[PDB]
């Protein structure tokens, strides 16, 4: 129902929230980020639709920002739904090589640029992309903002029910959650795809939910 929402978290970090009815999960609430580096804007996940992605880009363009790049945390539509529209506007889209091949295999449009690195800087000292290992999906990534100490966990952070298990790796998820906890204990805020933002303990809650879900 409602249009995409944009909310400031702090200087240069915004949450974008979009809503989509998806067969037999009802209306899904999806959070992404927009990160500002000087007058450049980066989309951390696309909203569900071309429409919401256009509203999001136009909001930052009208406020003087250039959209320099988007990164999709994984291949599902709540992270990649905007890619086709961004490509048509020549806004650089990024995904892991694995994510792009999963999109291809699913008959979806791919990000224009891909990368294979476990840890890499999308923007040096500002936006780090990290693969903790499989969980929600084989390809799931997190995004770390070193200056704000904010972690975007995407659909991997699941403090209250794991959600769509269709493409999940329950065997790996607890191991991947421990790897994430070990790397980003210093997160002062964890933003997830579908849960309220919270403290570093959301990584421990995710570890617990992963184990619980694995134990059938
Ligand atoms: C949307 C689609 O793209 C998929 C995706 O790729 O993520 C599905 N993946 C996940 C997920 O995150 O694991 C979900 S279920 C999500 C987990 N808890 C949320 C409860 N709150 S609410 N008001 O429904 O927002 C709903 C999607 C259906
Ligand atoms: Zn997903
Ligand atoms: Zn999701």
Swiss-Prot record:
Its EC number is 3.5.2.6. Keywords: Antibiotic resistance, Hydrolase, Metal-binding, Periplasm, Signal, Zinc. The keyword RNA-binding does not apply. Its main location: periplasm. GO terms for biological process: antibiotic catabolic process; response to antibiotic. A beta-lactam binds at residues 78, 158, 164. It is an enzyme of class 3 (hydrolase). SUPFAM superfamilies: Metallo-hydrolase/oxidoreductase. Zn(2+) 1 binds at residues 74, 76, 136. One of its GO terms (cellular component) is periplasmic space. SMART domains: Lactamase_B. Zn(2+) 2 binds at residues 78, 155, 194. The keyword Ribosomal protein does not apply. Its cofactor is Zn(2+). It is found in: Periplasm. It comes from the Bacteria. It catalyses: a beta-lactam + H2O = a substituted beta-amino acid. One of its GO terms (molecular function) is beta-lactamase activity. Belongs to the metallo-beta-lactamase superfamily. Class-B beta-lactamase family. Pseudomonas aeruginosa strains carrying this gene (identified by PCR) have been isolated from hospital patients in Italy, France, Argentina and Thailand. Confers resistance to the different beta-lactam antibiotics (penicillin, cephalosporin and carbapenem) via the hydrolysis of the beta-lactam ring. Exhibits higher catalytic efficiency toward ticarcillin and piperacillin than blaIMP-1. Exhibits catalytic activity for carbapenem compounds, but has a preference for imipenem and ertapenem over meropenem. Has high efficiency for the hydrolysis of cefuroxime. Exhibits hydrolysis of all cephalosporins tested. Exhibits no hydrolysis of temocillin, the 6-alpha-methoxy semisynthetic derivative of ticarcillin. Monomer. This is Metallo-beta-lactamase type 2.
């Amino acid at each position: 129902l409602p249009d995409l929402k944009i909310e400031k978290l702090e200087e240069g970090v915004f949450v974008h929230t979009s809503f989509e009815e998806v067969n037999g999960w009802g209306v899904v609430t999806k959070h992404g980020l927009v990160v500002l580096v000087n007058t450049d804007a980066y989309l951390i996940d696309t909203p569900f639709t071309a429409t919401d992605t256009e509203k999001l880009v136009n909001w930052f363009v009208e406020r003087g920002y250039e959209i320099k790049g988007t990164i999709s945390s994984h291949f599902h539509s709540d992270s990649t739904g905007g890619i086709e529209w961004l490509n048509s506007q020549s806004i650089p889209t990024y995904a892991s090589e694995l994510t792009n091949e999963l999109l291809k295999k699913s008959g979806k449009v791919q990000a224009k640029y891909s990368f294979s690195e476990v840890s890499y800087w999308l923007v040096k000292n500002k936006i780090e992309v990290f693969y903790p290992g499989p969980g929600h999906t084989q390809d799931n990534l997190v995004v770390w903002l070193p200056e704000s100490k904010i972690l975007f966990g995407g659909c991997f952070i699941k403090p209250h029910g794991l959600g769509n298990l269709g493409d999940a790796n329950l065997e790996a998820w607890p191991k991947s959650a421990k790897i994430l906890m070990s790397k980003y204990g210093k997160a002062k805020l964890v933003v997830s795809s579908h849960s309220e933002k919270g403290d570093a303990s959301l990584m421990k809650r995710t570890w617990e939910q992963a184990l619980k879900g694995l134990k059938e």
